[PDB]
Amino acid sequence: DPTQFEERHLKFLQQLGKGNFGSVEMCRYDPLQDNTGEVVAVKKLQHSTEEHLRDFEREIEILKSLQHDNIVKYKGVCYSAGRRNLKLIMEYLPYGSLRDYLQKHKERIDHIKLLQYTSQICKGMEYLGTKRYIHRDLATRNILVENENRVKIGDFGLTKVLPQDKEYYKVKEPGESPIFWYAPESLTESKFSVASDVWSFGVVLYELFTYIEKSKSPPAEFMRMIGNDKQGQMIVFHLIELLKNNGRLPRPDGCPDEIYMIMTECWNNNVNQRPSFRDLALRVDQIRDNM
Numbered sequence: 001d002p003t004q005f006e007e008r009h010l011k012f013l014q015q016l017g018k019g020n021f022g023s024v025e026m027c028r029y030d031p032l033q034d035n036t037g038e039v040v041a042v043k044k045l046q047h048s049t050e051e052h053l054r055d056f057e058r059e060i061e062i063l064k065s066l067q068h069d070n071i072v073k074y075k076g077v078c079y080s081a082g083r084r085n086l087k088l089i090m091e092y093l094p095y096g097s098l099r100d101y102l103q104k105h106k107e108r109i110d111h112i113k114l115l116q117y118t119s120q121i122c123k124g125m126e127y128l129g130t131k132r133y134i135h136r137d138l139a140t141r142n143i144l145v146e147n148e149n150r151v152k153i154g155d156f157g158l159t160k161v162l163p164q165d166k167e168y169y170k171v172k173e174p175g176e177s178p179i180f181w182y183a184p185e186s187l188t189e190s191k192f193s194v195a196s197d198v199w200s201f202g203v204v205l206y207e208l209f210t211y212i213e214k215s216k217s218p219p220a221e222f223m224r225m226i227g228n229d230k231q232g233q234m235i236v237f238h239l240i241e242l243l244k245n246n247g248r249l250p251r252p253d254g255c256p257d258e259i260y261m262i263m264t265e266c267w268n269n270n271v272n273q274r275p276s277f278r279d280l281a282l283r284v285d286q287i288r289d290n291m
């Protein structure tokens, strides 16, 4: 059973980065001890507490249940003795995150490519929705590049399962929250739904078409609009008020009109009026077709 990886054969190669409750490492699974083994990505908890291990177990079950071209592949798990510490094994995607990839190559990635990635992100999100999963953390840093032609959603650390009887999930005690990607109802009532994920998708689209320019980031832009003097909880208070009054991220320089229209439709205060991921993939594929 190759979903069973012995921890002693996992050789540390590189620290890939940190996300929410965990860190990710590039490792070679090398049980022949001859450096010929498969290079994999390994997620583990920085603080393996009771609460976090339960959420992590749930995250693992989520990813394992997802099989789609635009979702990072689950490979297996590591169990440690006694205290039941858990490492999640996943495919290594050598081109790294879409955020770094875009920040590196900038405008050398043309609109053709950006919209391929957009389509692919939409398709992975639509599939996620059919499982009644809510990502809550859709952003270019959580999307990975497999090659020039393929991206995959790559982290599911905040993903929640909808209750049977509700179309939203309500987070009662929020931890670290990417508030500059959050829909107004997520800011005000901690309500997360397919529709709030669509809101965040519009921010990902903005990210893409700004080519991750630091001065143009959602945090830098929203902070400018509420005023750089706002701090801590007052940021959330002013952002809510900004969004209620139709304050929005600006159109990125050079952004095609029909792409910009999509962003602004995703950023609708009215939850029910936001497009669906099914329609977004269709629309985006139409635009690529025209090009």
Ligand SMILES: O=C1C=C(NC(=O)c2c(Cl)cccc2Cl)CC=N1
Residues within 6 Å of the ligand: 016, 017, 018, 019, 020, 023, 024, 041, 072, 090, 091, 092, 093, 094, 096, 097, 141, 142, 143, 144, 154, 155
């Ligand atoms: O090659 C990889 C890389 C992965 N994760 C990340 O790189 C990652 C980090 Cl380190 C922090 C936050 C978000 C993300 Cl997606 C997952 C699987 N295979």
